[PDB]
């Protein structure tokens, strides 16, 4: 049975105007800016951008990869697919 999301969980994350995107729940570094209440720091693979999202926009990777894990024209997407499959917990600083 599912738990709450935690740092390190891999997802596809949905933002307005973008396809479901390979992403992870990030940690918040000591001294770093915290998310709003009820939001998680999402790190988008490929673009290496961060946004704050709630669970309604977070689709667990293993369940969703057959649907959303396909090449896309969008900038950064296909690099993102390599990252999530090959080294999803690396530092992409």
């Amino acid at each position: 049975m599912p738990h709450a999301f935690k740092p390190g969980d891999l997802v596809f994350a949905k933002m307005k105007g973008y396809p479901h995107w390979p992403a992870r729940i990030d940690d918040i570094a000591d001294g770093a800016v915290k998310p709003p209440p009820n939001k998680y720091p999402i790190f988008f693979f490929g673009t290496h951008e961060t946004a704050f999202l709630g669970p309604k926009d977070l689709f667990p990777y293993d369940k969703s990869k057959d649907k959303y894990g396909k090449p896309n024209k969008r900038k950064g997407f296909n690099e993102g697919l390599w990252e999530i499959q090959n080294n999803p917990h690396a530092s992409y600083s």
Side-chain angles (χ1 to χ4, degrees), residues 1-15 17-69 71-72 74 76-93:
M1 283 295 171
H3 295 50
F5 279 119
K6 61 186 185 297
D9 284 349
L10 307 178
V11 295
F12 290 88
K14 186 66 168 66
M15 307 267 273
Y18 301 86
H20 297 82
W21 202 283
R24 66 171 182 214
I25 313 278
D26 254 4
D27 285 288
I28 302 146
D30 277 338
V33 173
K34 292 180 284 187
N38 299 271
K39 302 316 168 71
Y40 292 83
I42 307 301
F43 176 85
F44 289 85
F45 299 109
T47 64
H48 317 137
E49 293 176 8
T50 287
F52 298 125
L53 291 176
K56 75 194 187 51
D57 289 318
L58 307 179
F59 292 81
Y61 175 75
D62 268 32
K63 181 178 211 303
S64 290
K65 61 168 179 286
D66 286 349
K67 185 164 180 163
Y68 291 139
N72 196 274
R74 291 289 225 301
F77 194 96
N78 288 339
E79 186 173 359
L81 299 174
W82 178 93
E83 294 181 348
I84 198 166
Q85 182 170 35
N86 297 300
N87 205 345
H89 302 301
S91 158
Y92 288 97
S93 298

